[PDB]
């Protein structure tokens, strides 16, 4: 009881949303290198026995609807849930190809009360995206 | 009755600290994702997840520094940010 139960029949889903190309109308440049990430992720979680689903270049609407649908799945025999988001962002925000969506609205689908079959189960969100425009100059050691 | 918070058992593994840029290399991928995959691969068969994420914090902070022809973006650093509402230890394996 100090450790999550990870011996359910399935480890769980690993949804990877890989956004590389953005509408001009956002001024975000092509996210070169992201496919190397998406492939690395896919193989890494496959080895961890996750049911990986890669999606590419989703609009904000498609991200929301995709996440709604996944959260409406029956995760009863799954130990956990992983979602990896690869995109541009700001604080609290991840970008669809056509614009920003609040991360809160994405994660809310999986709250303990609106996704009953993941209640009590670890829900992991891996977010590769900017959270603003501060730069860290570092300090010599 | 026994309840749990609706926000419990979430782990948000952010690639960078609040308010900051996150860095991505055109050929090797993002610092964070390459570091995360390498640490999962090396350690997921024995280390608890927070510890694994802690090795990723160290790798990103120590092995990467940006190189840019634009001085404003040159020689920058990044630390990732682990946000845990987890209530138990996470092991990606079972006995």
């Amino acid at each position: 009881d100090n450790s999550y139960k990870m011996d359910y029949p399935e480890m769980g889903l690993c949804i990877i949303i890989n956004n590389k190309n953005f509408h001009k109308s956002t001024g975000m440049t092509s996210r070169s290198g992201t496919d190397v990430d998406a492939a690395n992720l896919r193989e890494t979680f496959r080895n961890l026995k996750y049911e990986v689903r890669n999606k590419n270049d989703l609009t904000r609407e498609e991200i929301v609807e995709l996440m709604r649908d996944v959260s409406k799945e029956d995760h009863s025999k799954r130990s956990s849930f992983v979602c990896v988001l690869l995109s541009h962002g700001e604080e609290g925000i991840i970008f669809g190809t056509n614009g920003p969506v609040d991360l809160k609205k994405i994660t809310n689908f999986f709250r303990g009360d609106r996704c009953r079959s993941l209640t009590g189960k670890p829900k992991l969100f891996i977010i590769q995206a900017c959270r603003g425009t501060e730069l860290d100059c570092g300090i010599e050691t | 009755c026994h309840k749990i918070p609706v926000e419990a058992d979430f782990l948000y593994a952010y690639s960078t600290a609040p308010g900051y840029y996150s860095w991505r290399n055109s050929k090797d991928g993002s610092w964070f994702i390459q570091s995360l995959c390498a640490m999962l691969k090396q350690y997921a068969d024995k280390l608890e997840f927070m510890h694994i994420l802690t090795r990723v914090n160290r790798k990103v902070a120590t092995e990467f520094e940006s190189f840019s022809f634009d001085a404003t973006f040159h020689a920058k650093k990044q630390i990732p940010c682990i946000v845990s509402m987890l209530t138990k230890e996470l092991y990606f394996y079972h006995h």
């Binding site: 996210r31 962002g89 995206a129 | 996150s22 991505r24 290399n25 055109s26 993002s30 940006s66 973006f73």
Partner: peptide
């Protein structure tokens, strides 16, 4: 190296 680019920014996200």
């Amino acid at each position: 190296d680019m920014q996200x």
